[PDB]
């Protein structure tokens, strides 16, 4: 595919494939050109070299790429390793309907609720907002609802408060050691840009308010909304599974 400025961005798989094709063609041309053995036997070995470097580059001689000195990535290299497929693709992927922010205090909050910034909720629940607006006779069609929320009309704030109502969300702390690293809370719309967190849970999350950031995740299916209320909700996880001692104990 092309890119900005006109430069084209290609994959190393291409370079390697092109090499295999060039050398196979050259060999056939020799086989029909009546060449000696010292030439054709060199071509066969070059072909084997190119093919093996195309399947797995780094087991024969590490065929480098073009203008760049770095060795090009072969087929098998696009599967294994912590980076790439199977580890950074199929077990862990990025997800829509999510976000992150710097977290703060929030004592007034209950052990089950958390303060979620308003604009974050707007952007997150955009798909819910559009439909719930076009349903209540406030937006002609989906496109009109988009412009209504894009203009920040007053009615859409109350609409957002109607969609949040009992719709649990998921909060995650960056290193996830135990299962409590992800816990479901009940959204509490708030002004500003900071995420309010309940102090009693700071122990379980193992987080401070020195600049730590947390990520939010919005469930979609009615199931994921129930599992966030009867399985992941904060007030359902009190005593740790590792040891019967409660994970919810007063801090400083």
């Amino acid at each position: 595919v092309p890119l900005d400025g006109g430069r084209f961005a290609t994959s190393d798989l291409n370079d390697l494939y092109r090499r295999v094709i060039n050398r196979n063609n050259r060999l056939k041309r020799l086989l029909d050109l009546a060449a000696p053995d010292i030439i054709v036997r060199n071509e066969k070995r070059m072909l084997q070299e190119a093919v093996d470097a195309l399947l797995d580059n780094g087991r024969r001689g590490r065929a480098i790429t073009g203008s760049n000195k770095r060795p090009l990535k072969s087929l098998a290299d696009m599967i294994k390793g912590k980076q790439g497929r199977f580890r950074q693709n199929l077990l862990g992927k990025r997800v829509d309907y999510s976000g992150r922010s710097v977290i703060t205090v929030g004592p007034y909050l209950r052990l089950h609720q958390c303060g979620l910034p308003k604009k974050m909720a707007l952007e997150l629940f955009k798909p819910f907002i559009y439909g719930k607006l076009e349903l209540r006779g406030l937006a002609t069609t989906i496109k009109a609802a988009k412009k209504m929320v894009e203009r920040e009309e007053a009615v859409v704030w109350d609409i957002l408060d109607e969609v949040i109502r009992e719709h649990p969300v998921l909060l995650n702390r960056a290193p996830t050691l135990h299962r409590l690293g992800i816990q479901a809370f009940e959204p509490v719309l708030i002004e500003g840009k900071a995420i309010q967190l309940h102090p009693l849970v700071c122990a379980a999350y193992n987080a401070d308010f020195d600049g730590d950031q947390m990520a939010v995740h919005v469930p979609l299916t009615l199931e994921a909304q129930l599992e966030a209320r009867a399985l992941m909700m904060s007030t359902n996880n009190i005593l740790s599974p590792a040891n019967g001692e409660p994970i919810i104990v007063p801090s400083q």
Partner: peptide
Amino acid sequence: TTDPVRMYMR
């Protein structure tokens, strides 16, 4: 050596 360039160079 291993590399097939050595097979040819010699």
